[PDB]
Design a protein around this nucleic acid. Structure first.
Ligand code: MG
Ligand code: MG
Ligand code: MG
Length: 458
RNA sequence: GGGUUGGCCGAGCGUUGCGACGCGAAAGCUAGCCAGAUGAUUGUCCCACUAGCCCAACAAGCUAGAACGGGACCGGUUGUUCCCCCAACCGUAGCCUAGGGAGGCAUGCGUGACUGGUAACGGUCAGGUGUGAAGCCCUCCCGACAAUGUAGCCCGAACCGCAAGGUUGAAGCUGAAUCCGUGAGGAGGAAGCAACUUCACCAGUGUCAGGUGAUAGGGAACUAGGCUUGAGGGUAUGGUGAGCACAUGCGAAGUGAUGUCAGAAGCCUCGUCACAGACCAACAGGCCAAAGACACUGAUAGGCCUGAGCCAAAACGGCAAAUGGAUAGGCUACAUCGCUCGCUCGUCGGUGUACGGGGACGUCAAUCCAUCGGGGCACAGUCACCACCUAACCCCUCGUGUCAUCUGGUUGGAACGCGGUAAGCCCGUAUCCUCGCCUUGAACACUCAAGGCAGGCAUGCUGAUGGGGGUGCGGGUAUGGGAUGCAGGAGAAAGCGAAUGCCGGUCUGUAAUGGACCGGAUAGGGGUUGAGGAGACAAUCCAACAUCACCCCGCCCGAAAGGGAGCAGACUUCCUGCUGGUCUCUCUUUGCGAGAUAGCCUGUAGAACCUCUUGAAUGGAGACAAGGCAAAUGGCAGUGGAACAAACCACUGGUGCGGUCACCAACCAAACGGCCGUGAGGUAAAGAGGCUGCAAGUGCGUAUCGCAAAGGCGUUCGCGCCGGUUCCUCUUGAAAGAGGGGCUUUGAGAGGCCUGAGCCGGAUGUGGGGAAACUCACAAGUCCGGUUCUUAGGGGGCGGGGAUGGCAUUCGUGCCUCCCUGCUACCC
């Protein structure tokens, strides 16, 4: 009976087991890990967690080369019982090109809906290990962290007067296949047999180290985490070799930058990193990695960092505003005619992500010059669907007044009951700029203490 | 490094009523041409000259007249601000057109009335409203004066209480006397008329003066037009050499290069943090004690200026503002541009070209151009070469007229006017072939029927007091810009006793549609009338080819009813067949890149899986430690709290095999007074059957998958190049771009569709633009002829007729809703 298990305690019990394994690895035992993570993944009430996770979040409709698809409320009952380590083989992958408006067919392989449960079950009992052995200054696909905190550790490491003055950008080029299959058999402590079965078949080639998208791991829950374990370290190794030349490191999944003390320092830092990239098989490109003076700046994440005189301020980068002026322009070309309730409905959510993603930087000026340059598009859109009428007319037609600047886009229509309705553009810029509060570096959301962070902070 | 506010030059053409074909037979409208009649041929005076008078017939002094004789003048423009001279063109007259009013008329749309008719289908007046034109309305009245519209430029005020009423002033508009001139014209402006609302501030504060900025609205200039002496020759700064697609073209319609969404050309904004500002806020470097008049707070209190730069202080404060430059004075003419559909206009703004002689005043503004750089605009064209038509200004000849209007002729065209019921359909009638039925007041489902088939007709009613069907007649009704074409049939207006059709020849040009010539056919009789010639004026038929005015016979089809007759038969309709192109969808096909499961065999592990065989080498409860391993395990088991205890809250747990430890249950291979006992030595082990997992093969590149089915140029006689398609590589944020390996290609079947944009050549017209050529519109102007493109579906934009009226307030104009209700030519 699937509709009988109490989900109100599933999370509690699984989280309790995860806390146990985390606190265990906190002590240098390493043996108790492969007795709780062998007990969790071979029991009820955690196995159903994977099925529940995989059946939702889409991706449970289109199958791999099996035909089978659960999609129901009673076929996912013998699926639970059919999850055994003994007698397991994979069923390759079917390459399906996901359509794109631009036509950018991005190859995303897809596994079976029973195979996917295993990839989503073993993510448990491996996730607690990754958090406990993380790199302190590592962000990306972690729990409770946000991509804004990567800029957070820049008002501090680089913010004060002296700090550092030279930065190294760097970028790794290898795809997920280049990782040595032998190497992965000896470090990730999930299992020494299932992992061997997995790689040899497919499960690879899917994309580069991390998903191309920012929040859509459609099918794979293990792929992000393996990268965050193979690319770990790199911080104790960095600070042990070079002692006092004020070195530091940040990394948001990919896209990691290192602050040196002088150009001389950042010539062996590109060597000690190079040594710690051959034990795996993926190296750094000799085309894009540059050492940059701080007064010229660099493009890290969707942000730009520079120093003007004696002043640190980080502002929206040039090749990210231009994208936002290309996504809008291509929604006013496919939806030219529209009905004026589709212009507002389509262009509203588009101007909310680009506002949330820069809500915490010095961008009050940048939010202007980025609404006018769309205002001169709506108005030019308005006078192209009335090639005969006059200006005063198009104006009184699609521009209203609210009790403010009398010229805003919208329609002051009504409702069924005789109430004055309203619709209008967000007009990015009416967003209180907030200075974020950084996450403590050593925070670990699975240790039994420090439970007041994260959940309450969310 | 945080709060808030800004954005726009206007008006029409491309978007509704009629559109077929035959004929101007009469009237109206209109284009050339041909000849006349009448007007006009545009400032004022002198010198005329034009004649006349009878000024005697002047050397006459008078009326008055002509576009083109000569002087002297006045007014308005242009020749870069203003003054003084000079040169140039133009006027106050006559006549139309654009525009504004007043009537009738035809028509749209609906509301009432009286009626024509069996019933289909209609008619006649009065009420309310739209429309009367780039093709398509009639008489009057204004008529270059006007209404309109705006980016630039002006005003948009003082005033005193006086309850806001006047005194003003006023951007400006009308402008009378008065005087000087002969006169056109000058100097002077008596008297009137006029928008004048709303705020925000000028070293805080509470105070008075002076000032500043933006708007409600008014004003100036322009909007406000044309012709009034020609013809010829040369002269582009004026235009044209389709259209549409694209790797290769179609087509009759230049040759070339480049470009089509990561965008050529053109344009708007800003300078390396790269939209114009301004207020507060905070921070920093500075300045005056409140900086025009007066208590009021105040100096570890203020205020202000400058700041993502400087200086300077109460000044008109100055500097350079990506690199490099030019510059005086513009209600002027022309061409171009003001952030993208083509064409006309109107105000305003900068560029480029052209624009007399002196003198006076005194230039420069973050104004402008050229180059680089950053961010934006999209309905796809740009740039050179060649060939041709045109000649306003320019130069050279020959001119004596030119413009408008009205008459009388001639040739024409039409959306204006007149003629045509016909096959479809509706109704009436006649007759005939009829005959199908669930029940049925029944002669017993078979004769006077309802529920009610059907039909008529939303149970709502007649309804075997009946149904059904073609056929011959008789009334009424069609509503008509091209969209694959063709062929016969029902029908056939206008013309013909020889024709502008039709049929056969000749001949000529267009890409296609043509024009001029010859031949060829082409009607059953009989009777009145002469409608008008002619016979004149009495003396004749036409006896009606006056396309047949009116009756009888035969002729053919119909039950009569009476309908029809020689070749032609234009346009719109209903029928038959063939033929064509566009769609959607189920099949198969091969070329690409993925690709297992089942099943069968080949070697292996069972310690955590069973059943065993063995003589035993076995059965239980415990303790520690663990970068060894695993066949259902933690929907579990605990403690302390909700005292405990029901949920509820915290904390604890390594699940088994193997490692080290030890304990209890039977050993008797040990010792061994042979068994007649005593202590004590280990509880080790190996083969068999399925059962499962691993590494392999076969099952197979099979099912199952994702995309795709495009070729063209010369055979240098290989192949090359330009493309298409699929798979893989680096690239940035990108749909773009590059570099490689493959192929470069098949047939059926089911169901739909036939609507619209243009462009080209001649023939008839018209209105804008223009001097002319040409240009953009009139359903693609219409017609005809030759061509390419486009057909679910949205979004917007109009119009007509009514309702209770909601609102704002002009109090009866508009925003609105509620349907009815035509429009899509317009963008995806
Ligand atoms: Mg049109
Ligand atoms: Mg006609
Ligand atoms: Mg059309």
């Amino acid at each position: 009976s699937w509709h009988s298990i109490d989900w109100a305690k599933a999370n509690r019990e699984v989280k309790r087991l995860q806390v146990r394994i985390a606190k265990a690895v906190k002590e240098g035992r390493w043996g108790k890990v492969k007795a709780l993570q062998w007990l969790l993944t071979h029991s009820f009430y955690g196995k159903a967690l994977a099925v529940k996770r995989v059946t939702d979040n889409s991706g449970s409709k289109t199958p791999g080369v099996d035909g089978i698809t659960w999609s129901t409320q009673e076929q996912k009952a013998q699926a639970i019982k059919s999850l055994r380590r003994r007698g397991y083989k994979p069923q390759p992958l079917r390459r399906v090109y996901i359509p794109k408006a631009s036509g950018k067919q991005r190859p995303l392989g897809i596994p079976t809906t029973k195979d996917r449960a295993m990839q989503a079950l073993y993510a448990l009992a491996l996730e607690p290990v990754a958090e406990t052995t993380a790199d302190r200054n590592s962000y990306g696909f972690r729990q409770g962290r946000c991509t804004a905190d990567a800029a957070g550790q820049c008002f501090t490491v680089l913010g004060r007067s002296d700090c550092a003055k030279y930065i190294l950008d760097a970028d790794i080029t290898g795809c997920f296949d280049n990782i040595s299959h032998e190497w992965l058999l000896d470090n990730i402590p999930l299992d020494k047999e299932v992992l061997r079965k997995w790689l040899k078949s497919g499960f690879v080639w899917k994309q580069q180290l991390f998903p191309t998208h920012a929040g859509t791991p459609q099918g794979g829950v293990i792929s992000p985490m393996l990268a965050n374990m193979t690319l770990d370290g790199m911080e104790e190794l960095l600070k042990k070799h070079l002692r006092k030349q004020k070195v530091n490191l940040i990394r948001y999944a990919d896209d990691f930058v290192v602050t040196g003390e002088s150009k001389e320092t950042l010539e062996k830092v590109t060597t000690v990193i190079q040594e710690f990239l051959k034990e795996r098989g993926l190296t750094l490109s000799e085309e894009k990695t540059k050492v940059v003076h701080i007064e010229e700046g660099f493009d890290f994440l969707g942000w730009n960092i520079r120093k003007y005189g004696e002043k640190l301020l980080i502002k929206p980068a040039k090749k990210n505003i231009k994208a936002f002026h290309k996504k809008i322009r291509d929604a006013l070309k496919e939806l030219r005619t529209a009905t004026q309730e589709a212009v507002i409905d389509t262009l509203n959510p588009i101007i909310k992500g680009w506002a949330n993603y820069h809500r915490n930087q010095v961008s009050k000026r940048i939010f202007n010059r980025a609404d006018d340059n769309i205002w001169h598009k709506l108005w030019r859109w308005a006078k192209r669907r009335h090639p005969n009428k006059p200006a005063r007319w198009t104006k009184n037609k699609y521009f209203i007044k609210i009790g403010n600047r009398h010229w805003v886009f919208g329609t002051w229509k009504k409702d069924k009951e005789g109430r004055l309705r309203s619709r209008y553009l967000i007009k990015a810029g009416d967003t209180r700029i907030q200075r974020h509060v950084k996450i403590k570096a050593d925070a670990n959301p699975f240790l039994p203490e420090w439970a007041e962070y994260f959940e309450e902070r969310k």
